[PDB]
Amino acid sequence: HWGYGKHNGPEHWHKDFPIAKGERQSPVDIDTHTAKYDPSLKPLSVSYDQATSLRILNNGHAFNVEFDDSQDKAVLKGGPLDGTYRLIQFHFHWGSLDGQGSEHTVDKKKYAAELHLVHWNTKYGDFGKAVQQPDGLAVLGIFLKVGSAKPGLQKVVDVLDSIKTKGKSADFTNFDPRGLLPESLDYWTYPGSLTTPPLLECVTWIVLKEPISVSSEQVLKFRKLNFNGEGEPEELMVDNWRPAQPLKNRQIKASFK
Ligand SMILES: O=C(O)/C=C/c1ccccc1O
Ligand SMILES: [Hg+2]
Ligand SMILES: [Zn+2]
Numbered sequence: 238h239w240g241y242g243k244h245n246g247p248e249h250w251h252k253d254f255p256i257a258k259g260e261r262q263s264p265v266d267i268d269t270h271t272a273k274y275d276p277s278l279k280p281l282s283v284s285y286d287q288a289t290s291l292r293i294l295n296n297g298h299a300f301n302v303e304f305d306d307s308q309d310k311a312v313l314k315g316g317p318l319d320g321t322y323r324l325i326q327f328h329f330h331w332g333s334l335d336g337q338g339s340e341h342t343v344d345k346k347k348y349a350a351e352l353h354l355v356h357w358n359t360k361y362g363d364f365g366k367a368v369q370q371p372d373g374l375a376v377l378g379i380f381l382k383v384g385s386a387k388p389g390l391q392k393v394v395d396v397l398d399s400i401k402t403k404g405k406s407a408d409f410t411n412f413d414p415r416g417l418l419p420e421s422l423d424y425w426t427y428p429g430s431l432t433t434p435p436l437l438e439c440v441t442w443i444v445l446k447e448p449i450s451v452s453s454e455q456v457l458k459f460r461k462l463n464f465n466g467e468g469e470p471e472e473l474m475v476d477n478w479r480p481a482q483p484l485k486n487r488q489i490k491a492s493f494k
Pocket of ligand 2: 367368369370372373379437439440
């Protein structure tokens with residue numbers, strides 16, 4: 238089935254999932270000289286104080302930190318968004334090398350990694366329903382670069398040993414996502430898709446401008462993860478990003494002047 242390799246990578250996806258070549262695919266390149274400041278955008282509201290994580294899973298392409306979304310706890314609202322979008326999980330995409338890893342790019346620049354905090358619109362009752370809707374999902378995307386350690390990431394770093402291979406999960410309660418954020422909430426926004434199959438065109442992207450910095454030794458542990466499951470040939474989980482897709486005359490708006 239789908240992967241990031243030569244024979245099952247992003248370039249093969251269109252065969253099972255024809256929407257891969259659709260009209261609002263992600264990720265895209267953010268051209269900063271083409272993005273327009275948008276006066277109408279209300280300020281972004283990221284309310285993660287009551288966030289209730291449950292567990293962390295290696296799903297054979299990335300690791301997901303999953304949250305309890307059966308109440309309006311961790312919620313994204315405001316900005317380009319109408320209503321309330323409940324946090325369901327976060328995950329990363331990263332490279333084999335620091336020069337690559339992110340999915341979105343800024344004026345062609347690839348970051349070392351990219352964080353996706355996935356949220357579903359609470360007027361659709363559940364995640365599965367929301368992804369059948371064009372405004373069903375909001376994703377907060379945050380670029381990673383290599384510099385100093387992100388203290389609020391180290392707890393995630395620490396657990397990776399125990400979820401090495403496809404299918405493993407460990408308990409991951411009381412993680413606080415607030416320590417994954419950069420200082421500023423300036424952002425670019427456009428309508429787009431999930432970046433993994435089934436690539437559904439259900440996403441409002443909010444991509445932060447200010448990257449977080451993580452340490453060389455933090456990203457190193459990310460790259461020690463396995464695509465394969467226990468007792469299979471070792472295939473390092475690296476380069477699990479989709480490249481930039483055609484914008485197709487979408488509009489990227491900036492929250493900042
Ligand atoms: O495997 C994934 O990429 C997501 C799995 C998932 C499961 C439950 C809820 C949301 C999800 O993204
Ligand atoms: Hg959709
Ligand atoms: Zn993602």
